[PDB]
Design a protein around this ligand. Structure first.
Ligand SMILES: *[C@@H]1O[C@H](CO)[C@@H](O[C@@H]2O[C@H](CO)[C@@H](O[C@@H]3O[C@H](CO[C@H]4O[C@H](CO)[C@@H](O)[C@H](O[C@H]5O[C@H](CO)[C@@H](O)[C@H](O)[C@@H]5O[C@H]5O[C@H](CO)[C@@H](O)[C@H](O)[C@@H]5O)[C@@H]4O)[C@@H](O)[C@H](O[C@H]4O[C@H](CO)[C@@H](O)[C@H](O)[C@@H]4O[C@H]4O[C@H](CO)[C@@H](O)[C@H](O)[C@@H]4O)[C@@H]3O)[C@H](O)[C@H]2NC(C)=O)[C@H](O)[C@H]1NC(C)=O
Ligand code: XG6
Ligand code: CA
Ligand code: CL
Ligand code: K
Ligand code: NA
Ligand code: ZN
Length: 806
């Protein structure tokens, strides 16, 4: 109930929220059906439009006007945004040359530069270049401020998950808004775009910027705008708030535009109808900047121009129907469109089986435009699994397509020509970032970055301590003139042991054999040096990784590679090796095919054993440093140590072997040497975080050898590829992956073919940031470089996407 009998007189767009049933006057009352009777009359005036004309100058203040051209309007904070241009011979902000803003130039009584977030829905990254002719104001912000060529949204590339990720710095799996539509089985409640449940606070996890600000004493404008409030009124309201007394005035503001997304859905991303909505957004930016100029705030306020996601060409005829695959199509509920999420229609159906549903959806048609996954098998870069609202069965839909349950869902629910929601690496989904103000840099381009990083920067901009989030604080310091956050490297928690030769061959009973009984202080003093780390500077280029949790591990040196061997998990946590451009690939000699050798530095009780692999009919083994890349026949024996071995499904060894035998040398050839760090990942509860030992759900049969869910590699070289990876004097270049360690290759529909037709495509799909690997391993990489820590943080957040040029 609301007793809408009160008045909005003097309360228009009040900043505190009064509780029911007293009537509301804030920018959300419309959405609550709770505005006072006179809200429209007093608060949404429209008389005379939004611009001053020549004949309005000096007018007698008529309070019925939407905005004013009377002489007192500046001090009342309520002029039309073009007032000084029309009436006082001033120029529009867009017409002024830009001049570097070296220091904030603020009116007295401003404690900090205000932050305005100008967020635009569905603003595709390529609009910046492609619409540049019709967007002068946006183009000026972009060229004069700090801009990236694009910003990466989160998956799914829908509106609510992305706006709430911007506000919180959290992955949707952690913030809770995992789609525009959701079912929460614990609540037994459903969230939708239309309706009242979405207003219920229980959906919204983490701590958004306006709450962070408020709790730390920084006042916030109200971020959310009712759809019926026109853009011009939103701008005038922000500008009015900026004229409030010091003690009442917010320091942070948001404006939101439903465009260009609204029109993009109807006309496609580049429909000729898209020019007008872009002009219109630009005009709104012009109104804000002119308004700021009038208030002498245009060299005081930091302005962020940011989108939530892009827009792709999608039409009704590009829909895949689950009814063409499933016999039991009515026993499932599908969340449909540019992604799919499947659950059982009824929990009382014990004949529901996800395994049969996935098999029915797997590689069933030659050109199939979606791929099913159990959510824990999605590419880890998507971080889309750890939430009860994310259904176990997921469909990754090809760009330009939809999935639907049955044809009747499409024609009785072409309308649309654009949509979004696809994999967040897709070019058409990328969106925009521009920062302009005293705290941002001048005329600076920065590399693409992920929208999860911005919350930290928005906190930096307002002098706030960010709540715990998924950004990497410091990774975006290169965007800022000042206010940078100078992070320290985390402290190593576990220091390594450096074992020497401690065990005789006969102490081992591992069931392993090797044909290595083939025999000189020339070569024998030399091999001693190699086991003490004589070549360590070659294979460990950036310092050893730090272990950030309590564990027991050994550093093991070899001619061709160095490892950090976990006595707890019985395998390396990491194996580091450098492959120069000149390196040669050899094969495993016939006699050495099944050779496994005990490691005399490491006790039998802390070693794997070959018998377990013999007994386990499902599990084979691979090596972390590949025998193929050994520097010499004698060095090759090192690669067969039991301490270099890891458990691998035969199906996965097809992937791993091709990577090691073909791709590493290809990368070294292309990048002028590479340093590789590889190892196991255990993430059985799919939370993106390293498992403890008591979380492991699978072991090699009859043993304590834990089975990785994934294997990673980090491949580093010199950004300037004229320098070899092992003699690099400047910035680095990295690509990484986290491959799912799966007993089949069902994911790759082309896997019956030669590895050269499908393995690299798989790897590309499972590209990852070094940071993703850090979370999954509890390791910290790049501890010893000549680079600044902030630059290394940026490197650790890099994702090699394999998309073409934007
Ligand atoms: C991205 O960044 C984020 C943020 O930093 C990372 O997420 C954090 O990770 C932490 C480790 O997983 C986690 O810490 C836990 O907190 C528990 C208390 O959490 C509540 O309070 C916080 C603080 O206000 C709040 O944020 C939480 O909100 C969650 O839950 C509600 C809904 O229930 C949502 O509104 C919200 O969206 C959020 O949900 C997300 O997180 C939860 C996990 O908390 C997931 O289940 C959801 O799917 C969703 O993703 C909470 O309101 C605390 O209880 C935990 O402590 C347990 O474990 C420790 C081990 O150290 C042990 O000492 C304790 O005894 C305890 O164990 C007991 O409980 C067990 C489980 O019930 C039980 O099995 C045992 O037997 C014991 O009884 C733990 O410390 C932190 O909450 C989240 N924060 C957020 C916002 O998600 C995230 O990891 C990053 N991602 C990556 C890849 O890096
Ligand atoms: O327009 C849509 N929905 C309408 C809204 O609900 C209206 C109210 N609103 C708002 O006022 O924005 C608040 C905000 C702004 C910035 C921000 O970013 C931050 F925090 F970083 F500043 C954080 C929060 C949110 C969007 C919509 C769009 C595209 C679609 N495609 N398919 N369906 C769709 C539905
Ligand atoms: Ca885990
Ligand atoms: Cl959704
Ligand atoms: K086996
Ligand atoms: Na296959
Ligand atoms: Zn949309």
């Amino acid at each position: 109930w609301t007793a809408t009998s009160g008045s909005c007189k003097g309360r228009c767009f009040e900043l505190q929220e009064v509780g029911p049933p007293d009537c509301r006057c804030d920018n959300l009352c419309k959405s609550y059906s709770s505005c006072c009777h006179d809200f429209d009359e007093l608060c949404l005036k429209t008389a005379r439009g939004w611009e001053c004309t020549k004949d309005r100058c000096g007018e007698v203040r008529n309070e019925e006007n939407a905005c004013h051209c009377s002489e007192d309007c500046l001090s009342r904070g309520d002029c039309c945004t073009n007032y000084q241009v029309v009436c006082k011979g001033e120029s529009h902000w867009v017409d002024d040359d830009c001049e570097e803003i070296k220091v904030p130039e603020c009116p007295a009584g401003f404690v900090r530069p205000p932050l305005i977030i100008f967020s635009v829905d569905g603003f595709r990254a390529s609009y910046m270049k492609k619409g540049s002719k019709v967007m002068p104001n946006i183009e000026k912000l972009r060229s004069c401020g700090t801009h990236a060529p694009y910003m990466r949204p989160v998956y799914p590339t829908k509106t609510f998950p992305n706006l709430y990720t911007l506000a919180t710095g959290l992955y949707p799996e952690s913030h809770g808004i995992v789609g525009n539509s959701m079912y929460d089985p614990v609540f037994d409640a459903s969230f939708h775009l239309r309706g009242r449940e979405k207003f219920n606070h229980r959906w919204w996890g983490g701590q958004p910027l306006w709450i962070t600000a408020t709790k730390q004493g920084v006042r916030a404008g109200t971020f959310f705008w009712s759809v019926s409030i026109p853009h011009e009124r939103r701008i005038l309201t922000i500008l009015q708030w900026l004229s409030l007394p010091d003690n009442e005035r917010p320091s942070v503001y948001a404006f939101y535009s439903e465009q260009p997304d609204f029109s993009g859905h109807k006309y496609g991303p580049f429909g000729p109808e898209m020019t007008n909505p872009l002009r219109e957004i630009d005009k709104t930016v012009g109104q804000l900047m002119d308004g700021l100029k009038q208030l002498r705030l245009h060299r005081c306020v930091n302005v962020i121009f940011v989108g939530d996601h892009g827009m792709e060409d999608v039409t009704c005829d590009r829909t895949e129907f689950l009814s063409n695959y499933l016999t039991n199509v009515d026993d499932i509920t599908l969340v449909p469109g540019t992604l799919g999420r499947i659950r059982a229609k009824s929990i009382n159906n014990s004949k529901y089986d996800p395994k049969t549903i996935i098999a029915a959806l797997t590689c069933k048609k030659p050109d199939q435009h979606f791929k099913p996954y159990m959510k824990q098998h999605l590419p880890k870069r998507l971080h889309y699994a750890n939430n009860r609202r994310i259904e176990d069965i997921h469909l990754l839909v090809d760009r330009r397509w939809h999935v639907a349950r049955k044809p009747l869902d499409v024609y009785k629910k072409c309308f649309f020509q654009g949509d979004h929601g696809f994999d967040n690496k897709v070019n058409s989904m990328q969106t925009v970032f521009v920062g302009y103000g005293p705290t941002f840099k001048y005329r600076t381009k920065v590399p693409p970055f992920e929208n999860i990083e911005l919350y930290n920067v928005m906190c930096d901009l307002l002098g706030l301590k960010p709540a715990p989030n998924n950004g990497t604080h410091g990774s975006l310091n290169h965007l800022l003139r000042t206010n940078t956050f100078r992070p320290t490297m985390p402290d190593e928690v576990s220091r390594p042991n450096y074992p020497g030769i401690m065990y005789l061959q006969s102490e081992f009973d591992l069931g392993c054999t090797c044909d290595d009984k083939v025999e000189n202080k020339l070569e024998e003093l030399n091999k001693r040096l190699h086991t003490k780390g004589s070549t360590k500077e070659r294979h460990l280029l950036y310092g050893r990784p730090a272990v950030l949790y309590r564990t027991s591990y050994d550093i093991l040196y070899h001619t061709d590679f160095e490892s950090g061997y976990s006595e707890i998990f019985l395998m390396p946590l990491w194996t580091s090796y450098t492959i120069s451009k000149q390196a040669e690939v050899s094969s495993i000699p016939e006699h050495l095919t099944n050779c496994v050798r005990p490691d005399v530095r490491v006790s039998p009780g802390f070693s794997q054993n070959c018998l377990a692999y013999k007994n386990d009919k499902q599990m084979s083994y691979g090596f972390l440093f590949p025998p193929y890349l050994s520097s010499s026949p004698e060095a090759k024996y090192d690669a067969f140590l039991v301490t270099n071995m890891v458990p691998m499904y035969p199906a996965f060894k097809r992937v791993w072997a091709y990577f090691q035998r073909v791709l590493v040398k290809k990368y070294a050839s292309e990048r002028n040497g590479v340093n590789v760090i590889s190892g196991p990942i255990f993430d059985y509860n799919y939370d993106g975080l390293r498992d403890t030992e008591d979380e492991i759900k699978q072991y090699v049969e009859g043993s304590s050898i834990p089975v990785p869910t994934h294997y990673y590699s980090i491949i580093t070289s010199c950004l300037d590829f004229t320098q070899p990876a092992d003699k690099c004097d400047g910035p680095l270049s990295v690509s990484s992956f986290i491959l799912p360690h799966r007993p089949d290759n069902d994911e790759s529909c082309n896997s019956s073919e030669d590895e050269s037709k499908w393995v690299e495509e798989l790897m590309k799909m499972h590209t990852a940031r070094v940071r993703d690997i850090e979370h999954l391993t509890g390791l910290d990489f790049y501890r010893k470089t000549s680079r600044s820590y902030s630059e290394i943080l940026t490197l650790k957040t890099y994702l090699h996407t394999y998309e073409s040029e934007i």
